Structure 1
């Protein structure tokens, strides 16, 4: 099965997003690149930041805007999938999620769906309580859970952290 490597700030952003809002399902886009046979996840962007607080995984206009912006980044990054939370429901793809993931794979064969259920992590504050999986649909149409590692290659760790920090939609007050 394809290995997935997630750099730590991408995962932190997913988790913070999911755990921040336990009474609803949140979603966003995964940003990264292939590294030989491994799919690397460098960043995660919320639907909210692009104006879509629910179901941004289905929002083609947002995907095109994110893709156009990455067109400039010059780290050679692209959309690699989508994420969403399932608070209190555990981690799986629903029938609708499967259809969404099939469409993602049509546009990029290595696309993945990260599903997180942050409830236990919110309760214990231990990262070990996190429940998440990264899925693809197999060629036989089966949902498969992929092996996930944390990315630690030092140069890419630095680059990915600097990138993911730069895209975090921090709260701010503008000067006039």
Structure 2
């Protein structure tokens, strides 16, 4: 009772986290996991993408204010979905690095367990390819902190027949967060007396905004539309099959 025996991560939540991790190969991304904790099983059905201003190598820290906003969001999910929802865990990415938790990760996870005991830690290792084989590898590690060491937690990615409305909205928040980060930087240099600097700053801002649109926003638009179109392709295919199979 009350011990983390197994973690059941919904496929749609898995897609969001992976999409978040694949957004950049230079820095580590982070976010929080939401769901319900039953008889030793942490069922994850929601996810919050977080903003990380820090660009330090191993320093992946979720603020106190972010935890409060997430819990508040988890409170709203309960009223909406009519189901127990709560911050169950946290995730972050490992670009060009092994999926194994660092010393700081284990220590950070340990502090979380003083608060929730059954708190879950997920790590997504991305951007690791072979120079000759051209093969890519992506790892997903579910862990906790024991006696100062990292320990595996049994993970099963539970099938979903669709991508949740909340999961769809969550990955639409990514570009919005990124754009907001850029708006804050151009804010500190808003009214420059130097004309050359003003032209420079606008050119820098323009390139940065387009970059987010070209890499993040545009592909998500295409992915959503293609999904809609390709489902109709499959739907009509299944409809024609349903008639021929209904006989014998």
TM-score surpassing 0.5?
yes
1:84 aligns with 2:92: yes
Q: In the TM superposition, what is the alpha-carbon distance from 1:64 to its structure 2 partner? A: 0.2
Match of 1:144 among 151, 170, 175: 151
- Return the structure number with greater helix share: 2
The number of equivalent residue pairs is: 161
Match of 2:74 among 70, 75, 82: 70
2:64 aligns to what?
60
Give the unaligned 5+ runs of structure 1.
Answer: none
TM-score, normalisation: structure 1: 0.79
Contact 1:57–1:82 (CA<8 Å) still a contact in 2?
no
Query: What SS does structure 2 have at the residue aligned with 1:86?
Result: strand
Could you say which structure has the larger radius of gyration? 2
- Return the structure number with greater strand share: 1
1:162 aligns to what?
165
| CA RMSD of superposed structures (Å) | 2.6
Q: In the TM superposition, what is the alpha-carbon distance from 1:59 to its structure 2 partner? A: 0.5
2:31 aligns to what?
28
1:44 aligns to what?
47
Q: In the TM superposition, what is the alpha-carbon distance from 1:171 to its structure 2 partner? A: 5.3
TM-score, normalisation: structure 2: 0.57
Q: Distance in 1 between matches of 2:174 and 2:13?
A: 15
The 1:141–1:28 alpha-carbon spacing in structure 2 relative to 1, beyond 3 Å, is same
Q: In the TM superposition, what is the alpha-carbon distance from 1:58 to its structure 2 partner? A: 2.6
Match of 1:115 among 123, 132, 151: 123
* Larger RCO of the pair (alpha carbons < 8 Å, separation 6+): 1
